[PDB]
């Protein structure tokens, strides 16, 4: 055997019968409408159709080797395939698209391509290889530009071949409005037909209108429908086209929009230069080095035995350096890494401060702290990366003067990133294994005596 | 009897009236402008209009019969409905639109139907059919579309019925940019007169404006003003389109954001291709399977007397295959089935191990789990859907020597589909009626044992 | 005073000023560029523009003598006032506003009455009073609207006269894109000037741009700058016309978003067609009662100690019908007012049931609820409106064998709309004064015992 | 060295070199689509491209000596500066757009500009400073409107010089489509070149289309495709534009959206018009007195120790008339001054009242408060702004006779700003140092015997 939707090579195959459907989708219509087009290059046409109906046939035979989730297991019973494809719609649509309407060509002629029309109802792959796609890629927006634009293009492309087909119905320059006669040396060329036609359909999907003006009812009809269509549905693709670049957007707005709130408050409050210099040398902060995006709110929406091997392999390079955890117990980290809040101080910020409640643990992930003298400047220790502290106050230790206050004032000489593990997480998750705790406190009274 | 609004009748009705309204609000308007219209097909507008006033009459009789409700009750009184008619301003509108102004047909001649357009104000009815169906159809987004582009098309046909008019009272063909004389054989046919109207009246209000420009003062400010109408009310309508399209969306929009960040987050800390391949596999899994959707989100705007109803008629597939709900007290199931809250686990998750804080039960709605071997490949026992587990670390018992711990580790075969119930919820809800418990912790007893 | 701008004076003359400022910024640029229009009807010119200075100095009377909070206290000193408004740029604004340019008349002659342009710098007053009705407006979207209308109609009058300044500065008829020769007859009136003028900046504006092209370089670069005027500033305005819609459809467009949501998930989860239609008529029923919005979320944004006086001055009307409130202690009423939250309940909703966590007190605003029997028919009682129920189970009684239980079932026989006061609630807010739980629970022991 | 990315000397230079590349980004494409752009000025262009390439240099050397954060400290090693510009692909990007192509005017000719196009390379220092601008610029809006504008123009004058150098390609004057004959007198001048070039451009890219139609294939096919640029492309920016002005009216729009919904409820809820202008005059006075918008959702994304200096730096101007901070401890006032929720009261607002709970502490920032008699008319004491009450109910006192009630009820004689200090956190805060509590209780004592 089965192809396991969920694997590489179906999103594969799922490309390689886009080919064909979106081939089908462009030139069935091109030559049905063109018949130059279905003419000239009928040797080719013959060839690149029938290997899109051999891609189809295998597509077909794909989707009686595709397994499905029942249990949540894979079915990888062959007959059981062949019943769960038969059963669906995409069976009745794909036996459609596939039925040899080329047959047709030995009564209606060679110059009838649009008895392949049913080749276009495999569209659903199509889209699913995009739906997939659009998950799966790392250019999302890049790609979802690209498929509105195909969409546009393909509309364009299909509102062309109508105008020729329009043209063509109601005669070859019989009025100013139709595509002119092809027996002008200029205007029955394939390429100027199908460019001109390109041309008129883009000035009325677009709303332009810069085009000949109808002259028969039928033409007044189709270019009113024409031009309604071309708002309506280009207003439709064109603001989905707005949508996206908005949510390009998202992040970067978000956080120009905080920023702005702060700084009109800072100007209404006539905040002092100092200050607002601060505020904006800390925002600038975020953005140059990438935090403005909090990792909780974006991995909340994964799975939390999923987010937290995700947690794992992001903070594995320091909470190997820590004495806690991935030491004692060896296992322990995964019960805090989803709780480790992730906090960034300013440099000069005082993270500990001397007869403060000490109700979190911090664990230094990047950055260089001081356990600093009360004086400001007199730097006692300098903690580096793998360095926890605030956990003395969070213990109960006997002979501690200091009770629940902190022994020391940590400040950031440069921009920390910390993380705040809470008083009540370590006693919640440390109750499991306490032979981590010991050497804990080891670390506790040895700091605490000195 | 009465008719009781929410029925069908009711709705079906609001189609009956909305027929022979938006046969007035379309076509009072082409005939009082098109007079050939008028004049040619004279004795079937003549038919459709008494209908049209039958159905007005009923739909006023039909207002007589619908109840409202005070106290909450369906009003059945028909002296009291007479008086909650009269009373409204819908009574008003109606003896307005149904005032015998037809009468005037031996006055002004059958050439002014614009006599008729009193009957416009039952637009109300219109209107109310369609707020009735957005809510009761099952494609409310096709109707939405379907009523803007009803809205644009009598715009754009009533705009037409202007400016023929407006060439009517110029002279047609008194300047260049008037309708063209009636007197030419091919400007002189109803059907050209009515598709040019509609042309120019395309080309004004969706502001691409190829038509003939104006000559006269008055057809200056008309051009202008329908310019300007054309700009705001085609933005106002085909941007409406874009919200429709955008909500359309705003699921598939929103999963594929949440996507993009997490994809964004992963490839920013260089998530291993391992994890991010995960990852990617879980979102495909949630879509390809219709799980991008939380019941919770979506039924919490239902009332809990029917939102329980609706977890009912859903849940009812599992929780009969349960031990606990619906054999032993057989009502219990109700107390939690709003609070089962329910998780999707990913093949090979670790639900439960051994040595863990035990404070969460689990129904097995789909998939294959395992109670397993701490080695991680033995599978001891095969959890099939109805089963349920970790409720054993629930419950206060008596020689457990693991209390609050988990008795063994639960590993998910495939994708599961589960229904955690928190202990402090089985702990409130189980309180009410212990006969179902008595057998829990029976169960619980005989695995703790062995 | 002093004029107290909060009041109804200040808006009064708010609008008294807005009609100078709005007239001097449509006239005043249409007489510098029609001089026609200057010349034909100066008479009246004059004496508008007199009345409109006179306005204005009345206004800077009026912002001399219009108090303003210090410590949250009007101002009511008048040198006080005269300084504040001294000080600030409003007055910098009205002097210049008010400098007699006119006597420029005397030098350029009556032909240049773009003299009182400074006149224009009053839009602040202006500006203030759409600002402040916008706040005061029962129709706030109705007034947005046109007040956007107000500003495409001012920006396209504003280019009109631009364009045709232009032309005369090129010569009227040098070219092809400048205004045609005055001396036409027909091209040489003020109504054909203005109107026509007015045609091209709609034309240009609106971005349709039908108008003879540009034929200097002055032309080229006006005819540029001003589509992109037209394009930027048109989107800008006839977006914000889209959003000012938007927020129009935003409770309706909530409302069915979420309904859609509910719907999607019942097809999905293939729930039964009754209890489908159970649900969208719950809908139908919030819709067409008018009970989608919920006051908790609207009111929020009040003041605590004016929201009481909402709640109030609304639930008055049942808080009266009630025995606890208003009753016994008579201002009781407002400690709870802001607590209890309003439910509605189907026809056949059972609010309580025997044998269950007596945590709610019900009162019941509309509606007929019934004190059934357990069968499921048999109506004991029948709750009116003004009955409270669910509160026995709340206290603690002597002699109550049922202990935080259900005496009673209670349904409702309709819509229901009640209050439910939580029992936290109940107790933390009666423990002010029990001289209403003295017969709180004389009920409940008449009613325990029968 | 180094130059601290975040100081105001790399901003400085930001300008400085985004002046280059904006000049670059403008005029390479001119001059090399303009041959007389590039002939008749290459004096000048000459000086302005070596001055370009100069500060390009110097833009390299800053790159050299612009430290980055490793460790959250500011690197001020020479070579590691070196080596970490070496190794971003900006070092790439900057010597591609730095070599010398200028050599090949030997071989090409002066007429070929188009070697210095490589020079369009250092975009990304140009976006920098826009990056940078829109961070710390204090009209964020007007920046980003002018960003956008200048993109809108670049596009539109790069869209002018392909359409010329299309129009040069073809032959000047070989068809109605391309740019006339150069050998006309009007249309041979650079002048006339650039804006009628420019004049179709915007015709083109704006959709407007009012320009001659193609004539070739080529022409039909680049029409084509620059109108669909067009349509994609100034969608895209502007309707940007229409998200920067819905940005621009977020804050007013929430309000007015606020004030919308309540009225909506007053209107359908019938409230008095007495109550519907008493909450109107709120809503004027939240707005006219800047006060819609809540510090505490806008600071929230601020640094808890920047946000602290924050509101430090707007409160020390009350909480410096206080007793208890900044007097006592001295340092107290930073315990509490991030839980301070400012609230606002109407005049009359009865802040406490005698017999209620006592669980909020006041500050009074703004505004005249009145200790009054139950009566409601007689004043008894008049609290000006550092005054704080409410504080007496909040603590443990000995001899009080009312517990945990208020001793007098407060109102409020005009709009009062305080703070509200909850009971919990002055609890809280107040545990680390009493030697403030002690005088606390003084006053406390002092007021509850007299
Ligand atoms: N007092 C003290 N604290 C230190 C020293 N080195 C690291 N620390 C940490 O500084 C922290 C300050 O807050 P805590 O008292 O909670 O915990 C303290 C220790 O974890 C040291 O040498 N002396
Ligand atoms: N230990 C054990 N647990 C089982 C077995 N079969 C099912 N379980 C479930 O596995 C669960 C693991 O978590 P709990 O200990 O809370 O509850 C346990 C039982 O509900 C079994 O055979 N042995
Ligand atoms: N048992 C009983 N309850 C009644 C009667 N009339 C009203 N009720 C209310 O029904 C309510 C059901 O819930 P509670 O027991 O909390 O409180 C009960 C009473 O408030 C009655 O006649 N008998
Ligand atoms: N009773 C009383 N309260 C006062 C007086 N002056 C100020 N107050 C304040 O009024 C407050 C009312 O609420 P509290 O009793 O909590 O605290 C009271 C005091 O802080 C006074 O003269 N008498
Ligand atoms: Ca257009």
């Not at 002008?184 to 209108?209: C, M, N, Q």
């Not at 702290?369 to 969070?394: P, R």
Request: aromatic share 14%; hydrophobic share 40%.
């Amino acid at each position: 055997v089965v192809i396991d939707p969920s694997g590489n090579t179906y999103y594969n195959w799922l490309f390689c019968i886009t080919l064909p459907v979106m081939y089908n989708w462009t030139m069935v219509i091109a030559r049905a409408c063109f018949d130059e087009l279905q003419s000239d290059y009928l040797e080719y046409w013959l060839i690149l159709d029938y290997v899109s109906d051999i891609v189809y046939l295998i597509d077909m035979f794909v989707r009686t080797r595709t397994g499905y989730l029942e249990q949540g297991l894979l079915v990888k019973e062959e007959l059981k395939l062949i019943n769960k494809y038969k059963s669906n719609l995409q069976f009745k649509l794909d036996v459609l698209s596939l039925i040899p309407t080329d047959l047709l060509y030995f009564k209606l002629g060679w110059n009838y391509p649009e008895i392949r029309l049913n080749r276009l109802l495999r569209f659903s792959r199509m889209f699913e290889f995009f739906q997939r796609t659009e998950t799966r890629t790392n250019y999302p927006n890049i790609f979802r530009i690209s498929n509105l634009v195909m969409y546009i293009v393909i509309i364009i492309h299909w509102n062309a071949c109508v105008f020729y087909s329009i043209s063509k119905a109601i005669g070859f320059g019989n009025d100013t409005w139709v595509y002119p006669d092809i027996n002008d040396p200029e205007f029955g060329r394939l390429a100027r037909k199908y460019v001109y036609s390109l041309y008129w359909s883009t000035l009325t999907l677009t709303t332009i209108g810069q085009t000949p003006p109808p002259v028969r009812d039928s033409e007044y009809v189709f270019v009113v429908v024409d031009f309604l269509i071309g708002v309506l549905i280009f207003a439709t693709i064109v603001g989905n086209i707005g949508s996206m670049i908005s949510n390009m957007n998202a992040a970067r707005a978000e956080f120009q929009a905080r920023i702005d709130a702060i700084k009109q408050y800072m100007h209404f409050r006539n905040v002092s230069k100092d200050m607002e210099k601060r505020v904006i040398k800390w925002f600038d902060y975020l953005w140059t080095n990438k935090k403005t995006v909090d990792e909780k709110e974006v991995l909340k929406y994964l799975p939390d035995k999923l987010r937290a091997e995700i947690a794992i392999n992001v903070h594995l390079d320091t909470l190997k350096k820590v004495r806690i955890f991935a030491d004692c117990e060896a296992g322990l980290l995964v019960e805090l890494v989803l709780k480790l809040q992730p906090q960034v101080y300013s440099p000069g910020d005082y993270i500990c401060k001397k007869g403060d409640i000490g109700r979190e643990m911090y664990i230094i992930k990047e950055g260089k702290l001081a356990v600093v003298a009360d004086d400001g400047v007199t730097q006692f220790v300098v903690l580096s990366d793998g360095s926890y502290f605030g956990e003395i106050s969070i213990l109960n230790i006997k002979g501690s003067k200091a009770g629940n206050r902190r022994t020391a004032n940590i400040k950031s000489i440069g921009y920390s990133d910390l993380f705040c593990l809470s008083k009540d997480d370590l006693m919640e998750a440390l109750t499991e294994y306490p032979d981590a705790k010991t050497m804990l406190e080891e670390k506790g009274k040895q700091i605490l005596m000195k």
